[PDB]
Write a protein that binds this ligand. Structure first.
Ligand SMILES: *[C@@H]1O[C@H](CO[C@@H]2O[C@@H](C)[C@@H](O)[C@@H](O)[C@@H]2O)[C@@H](O[C@@H]2O[C@H](CO)[C@@H](O[C@@H]3O[C@H](CO)[C@@H](O)[C@H](O)[C@@H]3O)[C@H](O)[C@H]2NC(C)=O)[C@H](O)[C@H]1NC(C)=O
Ligand SMILES: *[C@@H]1O[C@H](CO[C@@H]2O[C@@H](C)[C@@H](O)[C@@H](O)[C@@H]2O)[C@@H](O[C@@H]2O[C@H](CO)[C@@H](O[C@@H]3O[C@H](CO)[C@@H](O)[C@H](O)[C@@H]3O)[C@H](O)[C@H]2NC(C)=O)[C@H](O)[C@H]1NC(C)=O
Ligand SMILES: *[C@@H]1O[C@H](CO)[C@@H](O[C@@H]2O[C@H](CO)[C@@H](O[C@@H]3O[C@H](CO)[C@@H](O)[C@H](O)[C@H]3NC(C)=O)[C@H](O)[C@H]2NC(C)=O)[C@H](O)[C@H]1NC(C)=O
Ligand SMILES: *[C@@H]1O[C@H](CO)[C@@H](O[C@@H]2O[C@H](CO)[C@@H](O)[C@H](O)[C@H]2NC(C)=O)[C@H](O)[C@H]1NC(C)=O
Ligand SMILES: *[C@@H]1O[C@H](CO)[C@@H](O[C@@H]2O[C@H](CO)[C@@H](O)[C@H](O)[C@H]2NC(C)=O)[C@H](O)[C@H]1NC(C)=O
Ligand SMILES: *[C@@H]1O[C@H](CO)[C@@H](O[C@@H]2O[C@H](CO)[C@@H](O)[C@H](O)[C@H]2NC(C)=O)[C@H](O)[C@H]1NC(C)=O
Ligand SMILES: *[C@@H]1O[C@H](CO)[C@@H](O[C@@H]2O[C@H](CO)[C@@H](O)[C@H](O)[C@H]2NC(C)=O)[C@H](O)[C@H]1NC(C)=O
Ligand SMILES: O=C(CCN(Cc1ccc2c(c1)OCO2)Cc1ccc2c(c1)OCO2)NO
Ligand SMILES: O=C(CCN(Cc1ccc2c(c1)OCO2)Cc1ccc2c(c1)OCO2)NO
Ligand SMILES: *[C@@H]1O[C@H](CO)[C@@H](O)[C@H](O)[C@H]1NC(C)=O
Ligand SMILES: *[C@@H]1O[C@H](CO)[C@@H](O)[C@H](O)[C@H]1NC(C)=O
Ligand SMILES: [Ca+2]
Ligand SMILES: [Ca+2]
Ligand SMILES: [Ca+2]
Ligand SMILES: [Ca+2]
Ligand SMILES: [Zn+2]
Ligand SMILES: [Zn+2]
Lengths: 532, 535
């Protein structure tokens, strides 16, 4: 589906303008979509500085873009309801030189277009272009392509689909709005020669003979073991013996205060802040400690300087846990895991590691894990709720999320809603909390970020958000006077806002959103007033 | 004592070379002395990159410098036994253009020189120069100067002084080795036109009604009171009731109202020149154990608008109701404001509140470990010779545990305090390198003044070494792992190493001077940091 002409290609970075007719939320969502290009490709973006060709983003009616670099400059439109990661990703892919997936020259072998049922003025979104205009890039028809339309796209009658696959099962798949597909990234790579990315710096499932270039120090008491899953890893959940590998550190024998270091390869950063994401178990004593360290360049070039960054200790949950550690490395470094034995006479177990990822991105502000989700989803009635632990953002605001496993508002869908929690800082924070962008994300447990298609939704807190339940006062005002008391956290929690129909039960049982029968949700609550 | 010819003046930053015949300890001590110049003056230093005049620091015999800029480049010698802040500062003051204070043209009015006592070849250190060579910079003769010799300097006979003050009280005062005097800084500023300094960013004693430009918002519930010290049993830290109608502190009361009521006190906007700052202040918490003092930043949101909050640290009240010192690390690289939130907890269980005085903000690290010894005059009476006190265990950035030993009445040196450093066992020791090979220790007794230009804090420096060994441990390195070389203590569950330090760190008579014992308590700072990157 790529425009054949080699003259129609951008030279990176793409220069851009965000027009002031975009709201704060749309500005934020475009800047968020840019980070997905930088994480999964070598496409990059810069502010406009007098270049010949550029993108300007505007709030015109609907979502649309020109195709390819048009060398005078061009518009992307992000209309009302178009401010979403996936939809902005769809439009920037047009500007990069892509047509829709149904616009391939071979598409008639794969789909039906029901021509009578398209709304007038939209028929060109269902046209096909001849092989002089477009190229296959040696790739098949990707029904999961972000550039494909959903069945009910610009239809006359809501009961009748405009587009269907010639095999009916794919009607459940066509027109996903999660993320870039694997073949969409492969096509974008094949068009622009990217193979590296700007912000994926390391990843390790431990399934290599060199263990991803990790090493172990002599200046410790013991070693971590490369463990055969023959007690199962996180990458494959024990699908076969010797297929999934992990690092294990036993704590059931020896002295207390014995330890082992696992050190990464040396890493060269391109940004000032990194996020280390990893999965772990702690089945041993409550006094065992998994400690994360950095060993960094001393400014001579010798990577020999230790810094302790975080400590983890064992509760009564012995299942796999996700961990996020903020690093702040600006010179070459190695990240380190120290496992420490404590009370071996009261440990029947140890420390486990798998599925490490390192990105040059922020770590998520709040993480909620809901266990046994496929059982919770049957045990919970329509409109019954789960509520998160309270989270604090960088500004000190308390927040949380409400999850309704069965939405009364849309059957066969999940409903996620954000709320503000009362917290220890409230007495000095500004109220109502507005111009704060909420990004809720349901993670794809893929340890490689080029494979992930995480669901995400975005909104910005506004003075327009009001409810009759609080006498038409702002939902985001101080929780002690616009919220209700909960014994689970001793909080007041606001009225909750978000999406009925966030993700379907038929989507959630796919793409590893439930990899160990558990759901992981990321929440960012951050001020975007500086985009005004 | 300054050189009169303006062609002898430097252009800043002064380019320098640290020669490899300096050991690590000496190189690290020189860089520490440059920080003291950047903290108290506008003098600055850069690594050499091919300039015409520069200073090369080397280890030769004795400790010496040429006087003023020699336009082709010049040596400073830093010999064995001269890796000390005050000695390095004294040599740098020679290179900047100063002679000794006993070399002033008027010196005969203030001191006697005993020439027949001077060791051969050292007598030129005692020469006086004429008013055509040297300026007084319109300053009086300073007995407390860093450029003045001690009585027993280059003397043939250990019992007989080479130099004495004409008024005998000053024989106990001449030859101080603390820091720059107030007059030495005034001379350096007059010679080089300094007004600002590179590293002092703010300070506040609250003595003016303007409260150093601090403001109080209305997004909080209440206000901090600017409180007068005219109440019995409550005073400020700056003057401690010495001075009627004079000493002010901020007070936030917690004995009435609702719980979780708060007040914000907020600084003026600050433009940091570095990436890291240290906020030092003094406080009391006489209220409920549930009261909080919280330090915050409000920083530029990248639009030029200072409206972005970050919480930095929290403080809570134990059973000590006297003034406590606090240090907070800030890492600001754009314009910002530092903020104090006082918070009420349990007003039905409070008869007091939160107190603030003596704020200082510098573009430096914070001290790695801080020890306060309370009632020090009474400790100094009630402790026998060679009995000891030991600090809580500190941890450095690399995760090594360390502490300090204080012997208030030193047996080895009568009329002196002995202060020493040890490595503590700690939770990281299993993965750290042993023995410590090249970590510099800096120990400082704080002269308690809120303006850093008024402080003469006593400091000592050494570097941990393979050569530090004891017969008590079969001639093994003192800095090997504390569980194999140290003795167990019930006081912290640590093993503490053999200590290394200075009998004669400071005299009892020096300690009862200036602001070393301000509220009858002693404050010791410690830093313990790797200098291998200078090799
Ligand atoms: C020994 O370690 C156990 C936990 O370790 C587990 O059991 C060992 C025998 C080994 O098999 C280990 O591999 C295994 O991980 C400690 O027991 C724990 O004690 C804590 C503190 O009392 C308990 O937490 C409390 O739980 C109660 C409810 O039961 C709550 O009301 C409290 O608020 C609090 O959360 C914890 O539940 C308990 N866990 C278990 C599984 O027993 C034990 O204390 C420790 N003993 C020694 C000698 O240190
Ligand atoms: C009420 O607050 C007091 C302390 O506050 C003081 O007294 C109030 C009536 C007011 O006049 C305040 O202005 C004043 O500051 C609390 O008492 C303290 O409780 C702590 C914690 O239990 C005690 O610390 C312990 O001390 C024992 C030894 O005695 C140690 O073994 C423990 O490890 C621990 O350190 C502290 O001694 C005690 N102090 C006093 C003065 O009694 C009191 O708990 C609090 N009550 C309520 C309702 O919160
Ligand atoms: C602090 O500021 C002072 C001025 O307020 C400086 O003093 C000036 O130094 C100049 C040299 O840098 C002098 O100029 C010289 O004057 C002599 C005669 O005195 C002439 O022979 C020289 O040719 C001439 N040189 C130049 C370069 O012009 C100024 O006369 C002198 N002014 C005063 C009032 O003394 C200090 O040097 C300065 N200190 C530092 C180092 O910052
Ligand atoms: C984006 O579309 C706008 C119209 O909505 C374009 O603005 C017009 O540009 C033409 C050609 O320069 C002018 O004749 C019109 O007067 C403009 N109209 C308005 C409303 O400004 C804009 O040029 C497009 N962006 C680019 C660079 O392609
Ligand atoms: C949309 O299509 C549906 C399905 O064809 C239409 O529903 C039918 O309406 C006719 C009358 O027009 C009835 O005779 C059928 O029984 C209905 N079928 C069903 C399944 O309901 C509907 O009328 C159409 N609506 C529009 C907008 O034309
Ligand atoms: C500063 O020290 C250096 C290193 O010692 C001196 O360089 C040599 O010094 C020796 C001993 O005085 C002389 O024999 C050599 O002829 C010197 N070589 C040169 C000229 O580099 C240097 O002379 C000293 N003096 C200064 C101020 O540079
Ligand atoms: C240093 O000076 C002292 C004091 O003058 C000397 O001590 C005297 O020594 C002489 C003999 O040489 C005795 O007769 C005196 O009684 C001593 N006086 C005192 C007060 O002890 C000392 O010998 C000198 N030492 C040196 C290095 O010459
Ligand atoms: O065709 C268009 C329209 C924009 N958009 C297409 C689309 C977006 C993401 C996709 C996708 C298809 O399939 C995979 O993921 C659909 C759309 C969404 C919200 C709207 C809206 C239209 O109108 C206002 O609110 N422009 O390019
Ligand atoms: O005169 C000299 C000598 C250097 N130094 C002078 C001096 C230093 C700091 C001062 C001070 C005087 O009075 C206030 O503070 C004395 C000295 C110290 C240690 C030594 C040593 C000599 O020899 C080896 O070990 N050069 O300039
Ligand atoms: C999940 O189900 C398992 C049994 O399959 C049970 O042992 C475990 O306690 C459950 N965990 C939660 C959090 O419900
Ligand atoms: C100092 O002495 C006073 C009594 O004069 C006592 O109340 C206080 O606790 C002492 N402080 C310490 C810990 O030395
Ligand atoms: Ca694995
Ligand atoms: Ca090892
Ligand atoms: Ca106020
Ligand atoms: Ca004061
Ligand atoms: Zn499209
Ligand atoms: Zn000198």
């Amino acid at each position: 589906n790529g425009l054949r002409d080699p003259n129609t290609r951008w030279t990176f970075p793409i220069p851009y303008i965000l027009a002031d007719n975009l709201g704060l939320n749309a500005k934020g969502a475009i800047l968020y979509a840019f980070e997905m290009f930088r994480l999964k490709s070598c496409v990059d973006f810069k502010p406009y500085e007098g270049e010949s060709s550029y993108i300007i983003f505007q709030q015109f009616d609907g979502c649309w873009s020109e195709v390819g670099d048009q060398h005078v400059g061009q518009n992307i439109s992000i209309g009302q309801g178009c401010a979403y990661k996936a939809i902005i990703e769809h439009e920037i892919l047009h500007a990069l030189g892509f047509y829709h997936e149904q616009s391939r020259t071979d598409r008639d072998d794969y789909v039906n277009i029901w021509w009578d049922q398209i709304l007038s003025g939209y028929q060109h979104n269902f046209d096909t272009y001849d092989d002089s205009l477009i190229t296959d890039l040696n790739t098949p028809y990707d029904y999961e392509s972000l550039m494909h339309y959903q069945p009910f796209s610009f239809n006359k009658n809501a009961s009748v689909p405009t587009i269907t696959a010639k095999i009916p099962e794919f009607n459940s798949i066509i027109g996903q709005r999660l993320d870039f597909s694997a073949i969409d990234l492969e096509r974008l790579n094949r068009m622009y020669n990217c193979t590296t990315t700007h912000t994926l710096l390391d990843h390790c499932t431990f399934e290599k003979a060199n263990i991803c270039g990790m090493i172990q120090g002599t200046r410790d008491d013991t070693d971590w073991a490369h463990q055969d899953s023959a007690e199962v890893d996180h990458t494959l959940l024990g699908q076969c013996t010797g297929a999934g590998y992990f690092m294990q550190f036993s704590t059931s024998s020896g002295s207390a205060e014995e330890a082992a270091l696992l050190e990464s390869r040396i890493l060269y950063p391109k940004r000032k802040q990194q996020c280390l994401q990893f999965f772990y178990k702690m089945t041993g004593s409550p006094s065992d400690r998994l400690v994360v360290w950095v060993r960094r360049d001393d400014s001579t070039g010798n990577v020999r300087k230790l810094v302790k960054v975080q400590t983890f200790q064992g509760d009564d949950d012995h299942n796999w846990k996700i961990a996020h550690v903020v690093l702040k490395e600006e010179q070459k470094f190695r990240y380190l895991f120290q496992g420490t034995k404590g009370d071996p006479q009261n440990s029947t177990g140890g420390i486990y590691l798998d599925d490490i990822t390192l990105t040059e991105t922020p770590c998520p502000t709040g993480v909620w894990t809901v266990r046994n989700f496929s059982q919770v989803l049957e045990n919970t009635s329509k409109g019954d709720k789960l509520q998160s632990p309270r989270f604090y953002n960088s500004e000190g605001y308390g927040f949380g999320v409400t999850l309704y496993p069965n939405s009364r508002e849309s059957s066969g869908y999940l409903r996620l809603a954000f709320h503000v929690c009362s917290g220890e800082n409230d007495a000095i924070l500004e109220w109502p909390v507005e111009n704060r962008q909420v990004i809720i994300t349901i993670l794809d447990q893929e340890p490689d970020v080029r494979n992930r298609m995480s669901s995400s939704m975005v909104f910005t807190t506004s003075k327009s958000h009001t409810s009759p339940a609080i006498n038409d006062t702002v939902i985001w005002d101080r929780p002690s006077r616009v919220g209700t008391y909960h014994t689970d956290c001793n909080c007041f929690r606001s009225i909750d806002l978000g999406w009925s129909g966030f993700i379907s039960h038929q989507m959630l049982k796919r793409r590893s959103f439930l990899k160990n029968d558990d759901l992981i949700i990321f929440v960012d609550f951050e001020d975007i007033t500086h985009l005004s």
